[PDB]
């Protein structure tokens, strides 16, 4: 039973890693960078097999590209190591601490969450990215990637463990499931005696499955049906690039704007402009009946459009009466990722920011910013969209919990 033996191994190794100094964990991560550099040949030969196998099966090249490695991409993995080494270790940070009226000292102190299961598909960089975030934060890791990237991931994991072997961090801090079979995923997300957290990455099918069936705590990096509302007093000239940025900079990633809500008092003036500009960038524009009264060639929006995240150069536009209707629309259709208001009105900005509950809520800013690098985290595993433990970018601090440390002088409870 590969899964059980490897889950036992990461749990045992955690006993050592959780109390390693940052110096030792940084040394391990530096060695990871060094072994990746040294094992380029092996990693690329393994990856050549994965790539030729995907091409044989007629996987389309945009997906092969997700799987493909070369020197530059190994360099990105190396740079990720260097970024993580430079980040502050959250382990041991005091959240707060005080002295009670009787002299008892109380503190809340951050500690590692425990072994993390990562269930992911085909991007081999994910192997390094998650590992180094886990190790830095004092967590072991159990990796299960896609059958497409299996050779690549073996070679990378082999390089990682070679590095670990030259430190005091046990090699079994990083274990990797070679059995691709997906029945294993169902077992893995129920292993509460070994894993403290699982984080699915990849398609929504896989994320839904893991989140629906897990008994181990999950951080769900959910769907991003993201709205931008253009209010009456928005600076319409500056609004245009924000909307374009949000939609077209990276349409395939989930903080892309999918929906545009537009105040009725500027709709006649603004819709012809924004629709023209969206079309210059290859965007297919769908619209409500009021949108279509104004710009008669837009594709008629259907009821299914409003909840749908396109992840493509497609957008649906609705005219709303005011910020109150904008809020009602977003509450009905948001998936709690990113939401933005473009306005010059203090009260409307304030109401929007207070009433819209999503991982990130913006005034006069692109939804593209919802990202750990942009938010000053350095590196992330992904964007959590749940209202539990962590929301937004999941970086080093989000991979910790805490405990109370209490220092007395033989204190007894009254």
UniProtKB/Swiss-Prot annotation:
GO cellular component: cytoplasm
Alphabetical list of Pfam families matching this protein: Aldedh (PF00171)
Keywords from the named record: Amino-acid biosynthesis, Cytoplasm, NADP, Oxidoreductase, Proline biosynthesis
Domain of life: Bacteria
EC number: 1.2.1.41
Catalytic activity: L-glutamate 5-semialdehyde + phosphate + NADP(+) = L-glutamyl 5-phosphate + NADPH + H(+)
Record-level Gene Ontology MF annotations: glutamate-5-semialdehyde dehydrogenase activity; NADP binding
Keyword Mitochondrion: no
CDD domains: ALDH_F18-19_ProA-GPR
Pathway(s) where this gene product acts: Amino-acid biosynthesis; L-proline biosynthesis; L-glutamate 5-semialdehyde from L-glutamate: step 2/2
Cited Gene3D superfamilies: Aldehyde Dehydrogenase, Chain A, domain 1, Aldehyde Dehydrogenase, Chain A, domain 2
Family (UniProt): Belongs to the gamma-glutamyl phosphate reductase family.
Job description of the protein: Catalyzes the NADPH-dependent reduction of L-glutamate 5-phosphate into L-glutamate 5-semialdehyde and phosphate. The product spontaneously undergoes cyclization to form 1-pyrroline-5-carboxylate.
Protein name, UniProt field: Gamma-glutamyl phosphate reductase
Species for this entry: Thermotoga maritima (strain ATCC 43589 / DSM 3109 / JCM 10099 / NBRC 100826 / MSB8)
